[PDB]
Amino acid sequence: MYNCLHSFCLSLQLEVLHSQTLMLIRERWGDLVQVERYHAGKCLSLSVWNQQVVHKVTIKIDENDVSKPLQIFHDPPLPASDSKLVER
Amino acid sequence: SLAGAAQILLKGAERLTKSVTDFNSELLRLRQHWKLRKVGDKILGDLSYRSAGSLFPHHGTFEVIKNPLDVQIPSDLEGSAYIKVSIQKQAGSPHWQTKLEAAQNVLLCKEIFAQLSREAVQIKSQVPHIVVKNQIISQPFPSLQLSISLCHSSNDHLYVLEHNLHLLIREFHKQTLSSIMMPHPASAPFGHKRMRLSGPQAFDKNEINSLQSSEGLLEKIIKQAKHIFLRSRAAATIDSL
Amino acid sequence: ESGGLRPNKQTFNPTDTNALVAAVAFGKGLS
Amino acid sequence: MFYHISLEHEILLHPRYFGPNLLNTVKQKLFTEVEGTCTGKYGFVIAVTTIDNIGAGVIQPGRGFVLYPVKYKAIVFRPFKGEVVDAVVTQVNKVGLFTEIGPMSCFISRHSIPSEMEFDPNSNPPCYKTMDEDIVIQQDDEIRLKIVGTRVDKNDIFAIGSLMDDYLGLV
Amino acid sequence: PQSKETLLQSYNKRLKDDIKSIMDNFTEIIKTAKIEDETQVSRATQGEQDNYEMHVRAANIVRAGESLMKLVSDLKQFLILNDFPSVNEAIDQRNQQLRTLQEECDRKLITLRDEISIDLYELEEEYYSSSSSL
Amino acid sequence: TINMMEYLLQGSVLDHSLESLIHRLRGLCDNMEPETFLDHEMVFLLKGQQASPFVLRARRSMDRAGAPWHLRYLGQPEMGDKNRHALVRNCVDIATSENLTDFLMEMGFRMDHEFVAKGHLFRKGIMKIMVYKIFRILVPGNTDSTEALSLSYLVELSVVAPAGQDMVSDDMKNFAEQLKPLVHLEKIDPKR
Amino acid sequence: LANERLRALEDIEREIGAILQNAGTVILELSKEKTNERLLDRQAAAFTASVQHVEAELSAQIRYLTQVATGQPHEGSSYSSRKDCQMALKRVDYARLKLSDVARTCEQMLEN
């Protein structure tokens, strides 16, 4: 029951974040942020600081996580260790 | 049998007379103040400035229901909203009248902040801004921090810049719906008046570019804020002196 | 006895239309 | 007559429409062309009540398009020869009477009009009236006309109105 | 024009069907009540049937009158929602009220500004000239 | 430059009903105060070796001070499809200085017929509806005295489209349909 | 527009009257002693006349509608003037507030 509920709510959160990203692309940002790859229930890649005027931000769900907490992954750069900023 | 018939008839008629001797009057009054239209059986009205030249893709269609009548506001236009502009040195009315005025004010504040946030993100300007969710932060002078935030209640502040924001977006609407676009010569096509005068009364580059200037609400507001700060600074300096 | 007509007040005259357009294009009744 | 029948129609779907929502795209597209077009064999088509089934998409070599045979149910209206149908008069003229039956429009020649009936040019609204005024036909009136025959062109059917048969015209 | 022709036709059909129906329902009540000779069916049936029939037709007439009232109200709403000339005149009239209000407010504010400015001038000529000298 | 085609539908209103049409147009059209323009137009024709004389229409706005004369060339009708239900002509619109009359006469264009048009102009989107009463001008040169060509007023719906894409006529037909009960605006061929 | 108001009033009145008439007539129909003979006939005539009148009035008012039942929902609004006036009133209120505050400070000065 916990595994099914967790998978469902995490996929719903992925969908909500994807809708928020497309809404931001539509109105305010306007090509200043892009969607590289979006896999429903697997990962969603957002690219900022484009080459015109690249980096990606992947938000994924892994079946069930017990040994390691499931957080977000900044895949391309792997940002440096900034104690205050990387935590936020 | 005829007794029953007569009884029913009389009851109905007298019921109609009891419903005859102010929904009609209410609806009539609601029309003069707010434009209305007839579709199906759910009569709607206009709650947007689209008549006054606003290019905002939002349907301002508020419903009217019999409950002597009630106005149904579109969702997300409810509550009260007011834009807040602040400088920090760091870094008698009818029941439906109040509802419709508040929802129209919320719609205009959303229009203003959409314009401001888009101009902050996309237009390249000196000392760029940060738009987080509902808050724009700019640094016009290096010791100065200006903040424009759309406070949506959903149930230090300078009024002058908020009032000028409303008037700036109001002039920006009225530029499209202007009588300057009308050509008095019937044959003459359309468009601004001085752009017509540019042909025979020959204009240079500078007048042509001054008639057609690409500026923004954010740029003008920042200029105004900077001027206010400078004035305040000079005043304080002379006072100390 | 539901009478017959009630409002027959014609708004536009087709002869008038023809005349006006004619003038505008060639120039009848103007030279 | 209003007849609810199943039609066999084909859809040419551009590949750009492939991907998400391809099946309802065919359903959505089907309504675009079927509605607003008529055919003599089936008459004017009003609406598609439902889609009975969706066929397999057959590729055309070289073209790249797809052929979807779709079975759908729709109501059609077709004039039949020698039948009487209620009609509405649109415009009244000395040459003939123009009447509309929904999508179908019919023209009534002066000869088909009864001999005793005469055009009323003096009256501001063009109309046909009798000497005794027993029966009067005017624009936007209920009349019944016998269809002499069904004739079609450019996906449009318009027949002749015959008032010779008994129990026809306004009442 | 097509869509205006259709709206007119629908309202007119409502009204025509309506007068015809009220008159016909009254006629059916009178075709009836007429105590005619009975046979076979028997009063025990005829009687109750007639009573029920009269009741139902009375209800029908009342409903047709209610529909008449509804259509009248609809016409009233249409004539206030979108008459067209009256609506244009009313919009022009509200523009008048608003404009006068604006004018009055503007004049008031300007006069206020002038008087306050004169007071400010007096104070600026004072405070600045004050001896004090901390 | 791309060419500018003018889509035109022309119809007439008798004077008695002018008030009803004015109120109606104000309601459907964008909310702008009526322009109430008055203008004088003289058409110049060039009698060259080719039989057809080039026709250039010159317009001066007497009512609006400090507004330039407008010179326009109107092409032959391009109407083809019955569905379009519009009149299509090529059009070039050029604002000109006051010394327009002299330049045209020296060039060789000859003044032919002059008319004065007075009426109201209203606009909806690109569409412009002009309602005007043409007045004949008598005496060789002047605008002081005019006689009415007709009691009725011509109503013309004109769109100066860029000539890119189409369906411009469809929008015009829909708007014309609303005024059709009040006044039948239709495409009337200039010929006869 | 008072014309439409009067029309509606007349309509309602006539309708109520006709249904009262029908009621009375059917009540006299069941009556064992219908004393209102000529009176009853007069009532029938009146009811018929009323229905005819109602019908005619309705048709005429429908035309009055369809003369300008343009279908078009009408664009023209007073939103411009209204918004401007609201802005002006708010500005005057702000001015009044500032004036009151300055007056209060001056009062404070006097109080010492």
GROMACS .gro file of N, CA and C in nm, chain D residues 35-95:
model
  183
  395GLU      N    1  -1.987   1.689  -4.203
  395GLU     CA    2  -2.082   1.796  -4.177
  395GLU      C    3  -2.058   1.911  -4.275
  396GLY      N    4  -2.164   1.958  -4.339
  396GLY     CA    5  -2.155   2.064  -4.436
  396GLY      C    6  -2.148   2.019  -4.581
  397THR      N    7  -2.144   1.889  -4.606
  397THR     CA    8  -2.140   1.835  -4.742
  397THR      C    9  -2.253   1.734  -4.759
  398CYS      N   10  -2.305   1.727  -4.881
  398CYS     CA   11  -2.417   1.639  -4.913
  398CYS      C   12  -2.381   1.548  -5.030
  399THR      N   13  -2.461   1.444  -5.048
  399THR     CA   14  -2.446   1.352  -5.159
  399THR      C   15  -2.584   1.304  -5.201
  400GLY      N   16  -2.605   1.291  -5.332
  400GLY     CA   17  -2.738   1.258  -5.382
  400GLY      C   18  -2.785   1.121  -5.335
  401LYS      N   19  -2.694   1.024  -5.329
  401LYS     CA   20  -2.734   0.888  -5.293
  401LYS      C   21  -2.786   0.880  -5.150
  402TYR      N   22  -2.733   0.963  -5.060
  402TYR     CA   23  -2.774   0.963  -4.920
  402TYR      C   24  -2.841   1.092  -4.876
  403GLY      N   25  -2.834   1.199  -4.956
  403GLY     CA   26  -2.893   1.325  -4.918
  403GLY      C   27  -2.806   1.403  -4.821
  404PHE      N   28  -2.859   1.517  -4.777
  404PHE     CA   29  -2.786   1.602  -4.684
  404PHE      C   30  -2.765   1.528  -4.552
  405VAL      N   31  -2.645   1.540  -4.498
  405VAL     CA   32  -2.609   1.479  -4.370
  405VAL      C   33  -2.609   1.589  -4.264
  406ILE      N   34  -2.679   1.565  -4.154
  406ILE     CA   35  -2.697   1.666  -4.050
  406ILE      C   36  -2.589   1.652  -3.944
  407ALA      N   37  -2.583   1.536  -3.879
  407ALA     CA   38  -2.488   1.515  -3.771
  407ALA      C   39  -2.454   1.367  -3.762
  408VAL      N   40  -2.340   1.340  -3.699
  408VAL     CA   41  -2.293   1.204  -3.675
  408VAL      C   42  -2.321   1.170  -3.529
  409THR      N   43  -2.420   1.083  -3.507
  409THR     CA   44  -2.457   1.049  -3.370
  409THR      C   45  -2.342   0.981  -3.297
  410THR      N   46  -2.276   0.886  -3.363
  410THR     CA   47  -2.168   0.811  -3.301
  410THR      C   48  -2.087   0.743  -3.411
  411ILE      N   49  -1.970   0.694  -3.373
  411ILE     CA   50  -1.881   0.623  -3.464
  411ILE      C   51  -1.890   0.475  -3.429
  412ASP      N   52  -1.942   0.395  -3.522
  412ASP     CA   53  -1.962   0.253  -3.496
  412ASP      C   54  -1.829   0.183  -3.472
  413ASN      N   55  -1.729   0.211  -3.555
  413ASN     CA   56  -1.600   0.146  -3.543
  413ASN      C   57  -1.497   0.227  -3.620
  414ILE      N   58  -1.370   0.203  -3.588
  414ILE     CA   59  -1.257   0.266  -3.655
  414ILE      C   60  -1.176   0.158  -3.724
  415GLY      N   61  -1.152   0.176  -3.855
  415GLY     CA   62  -1.078   0.078  -3.932
  415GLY      C   63  -0.928   0.098  -3.924
  416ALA      N   64  -0.856  -0.002  -3.973
  416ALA     CA   65  -0.710   0.004  -3.975
  416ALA      C   66  -0.662   0.106  -4.076
  417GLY      N   67  -0.551   0.172  -4.043
  417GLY     CA   68  -0.494   0.273  -4.130
  417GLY      C   69  -0.406   0.213  -4.239
  418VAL      N   70  -0.450   0.227  -4.364
  418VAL     CA   71  -0.376   0.168  -4.479
  418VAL      C   72  -0.284   0.276  -4.538
  419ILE      N   73  -0.154   0.246  -4.547
  419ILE     CA   74  -0.057   0.347  -4.599
  419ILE      C   75  -0.066   0.352  -4.751
  420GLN      N   76  -0.058   0.473  -4.807
  420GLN     CA   77  -0.042   0.480  -4.951
  420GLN      C   78   0.107   0.486  -4.985
  421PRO      N   79   0.160   0.393  -5.064
  421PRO     CA   80   0.301   0.401  -5.101
  421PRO      C   81   0.332   0.531  -5.173
  422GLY      N   82   0.444   0.592  -5.136
  422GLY     CA   83   0.488   0.714  -5.200
  422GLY      C   84   0.424   0.840  -5.146
  423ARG      N   85   0.294   0.835  -5.119
  423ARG     CA   86   0.225   0.953  -5.067
  423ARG      C   87   0.258   0.977  -4.920
  424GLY      N   88   0.262   0.871  -4.840
  424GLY     CA   89   0.283   0.883  -4.697
  424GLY      C   90   0.158   0.907  -4.616
  425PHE      N   91   0.043   0.924  -4.681
  425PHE     CA   92  -0.083   0.944  -4.611
  425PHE      C   93  -0.137   0.811  -4.560
  426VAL      N   94  -0.247   0.819  -4.485
  426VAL     CA   95  -0.309   0.702  -4.424
  426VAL      C   96  -0.458   0.701  -4.457
  427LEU      N   97  -0.513   0.581  -4.473
  427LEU     CA   98  -0.653   0.561  -4.508
  427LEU      C   99  -0.723   0.493  -4.391
  428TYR      N  100  -0.812   0.567  -4.324
  428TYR     CA  101  -0.889   0.513  -4.212
  428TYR      C  102  -1.034   0.492  -4.256
  429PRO      N  103  -1.078   0.368  -4.280
  429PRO     CA  104  -1.221   0.345  -4.305
  429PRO      C  105  -1.297   0.346  -4.173
  430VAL      N  106  -1.393   0.438  -4.162
  430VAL     CA  107  -1.465   0.462  -4.038
  430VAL      C  108  -1.613   0.434  -4.061
  431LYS      N  109  -1.673   0.356  -3.972
  431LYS     CA  110  -1.816   0.328  -3.974
  431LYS      C  111  -1.882   0.417  -3.869
  432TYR      N  112  -1.966   0.510  -3.914
  432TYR     CA  113  -2.031   0.606  -3.826
  432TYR      C  114  -2.179   0.615  -3.859
  433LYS      N  115  -2.258   0.648  -3.758
  433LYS     CA  116  -2.403   0.660  -3.772
  433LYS      C  117  -2.441   0.808  -3.779
  434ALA      N  118  -2.522   0.843  -3.879
  434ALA     CA  119  -2.562   0.981  -3.900
  434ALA      C  120  -2.703   0.985  -3.956
  435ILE      N  121  -2.769   1.099  -3.937
  435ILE     CA  122  -2.903   1.123  -3.988
  435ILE      C  123  -2.891   1.205  -4.116
  436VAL      N  124  -2.965   1.165  -4.219
  436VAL     CA  125  -2.959   1.232  -4.349
  436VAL      C  126  -3.100   1.271  -4.392
  437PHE      N  127  -3.106   1.373  -4.477
  437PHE     CA  128  -3.231   1.424  -4.532
  437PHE      C  129  -3.219   1.426  -4.683
  438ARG      N  130  -3.312   1.358  -4.751
  438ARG     CA  131  -3.312   1.350  -4.896
  438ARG      C  132  -3.455   1.368  -4.948
  439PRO      N  133  -3.480   1.465  -5.035
  439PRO     CA  134  -3.611   1.473  -5.101
  439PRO      C  135  -3.635   1.350  -5.186
  440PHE      N  136  -3.759   1.303  -5.185
  440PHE     CA  137  -3.802   1.191  -5.267
  440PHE      C  138  -3.905   1.241  -5.368
  441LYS      N  139  -3.903   1.183  -5.487
  441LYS     CA  140  -3.998   1.224  -5.589
  441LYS      C  141  -4.140   1.185  -5.548
  442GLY      N  142  -4.234   1.274  -5.577
  442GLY     CA  143  -4.374   1.246  -5.550
  442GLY      C  144  -4.407   1.229  -5.403
  443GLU      N  145  -4.353   1.315  -5.317
  443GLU     CA  146  -4.388   1.315  -5.176
  443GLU      C  147  -4.412   1.458  -5.131
  444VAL      N  148  -4.492   1.473  -5.027
  444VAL     CA  149  -4.533   1.604  -4.975
  444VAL      C  150  -4.462   1.628  -4.843
  445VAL      N  151  -4.395   1.742  -4.833
  445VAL     CA  152  -4.317   1.777  -4.715
  445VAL      C  153  -4.343   1.923  -4.681
  446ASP      N  154  -4.355   1.952  -4.551
  446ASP     CA  155  -4.375   2.089  -4.507
  446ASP      C  156  -4.254   2.175  -4.543
  447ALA      N  157  -4.279   2.302  -4.573
  447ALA     CA  158  -4.174   2.390  -4.622
  447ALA      C  159  -4.199   2.533  -4.574
  448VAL      N  160  -4.095   2.615  -4.584
  448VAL     CA  161  -4.098   2.755  -4.546
  448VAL      C  162  -4.058   2.839  -4.666
  449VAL      N  163  -4.137   2.941  -4.697
  449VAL     CA  164  -4.107   3.029  -4.809
  449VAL      C  165  -4.004   3.132  -4.766
  450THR      N  166  -3.894   3.141  -4.841
  450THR     CA  167  -3.787   3.236  -4.811
  450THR      C  168  -3.809   3.369  -4.883
  451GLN      N  169  -3.814   3.365  -5.016
  451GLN     CA  170  -3.835   3.484  -5.097
  451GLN      C  171  -3.949   3.460  -5.194
  452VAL      N  172  -4.022   3.566  -5.226
  452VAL     CA  173  -4.138   3.560  -5.313
  452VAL      C  174  -4.110   3.644  -5.436
  453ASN      N  175  -4.126   3.585  -5.554
  453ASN     CA  176  -4.100   3.653  -5.680
  453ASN      C  177  -4.205   3.611  -5.782
  454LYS      N  178  -4.224   3.697  -5.883
  454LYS     CA  179  -4.317   3.666  -5.990
  454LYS      C  180  -4.273   3.541  -6.067
  455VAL      N  181  -4.143   3.528  -6.093
  455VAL     CA  182  -4.093   3.415  -6.169
  455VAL      C  183  -4.122   3.284  -6.096
   0.00000   0.00000   0.00000
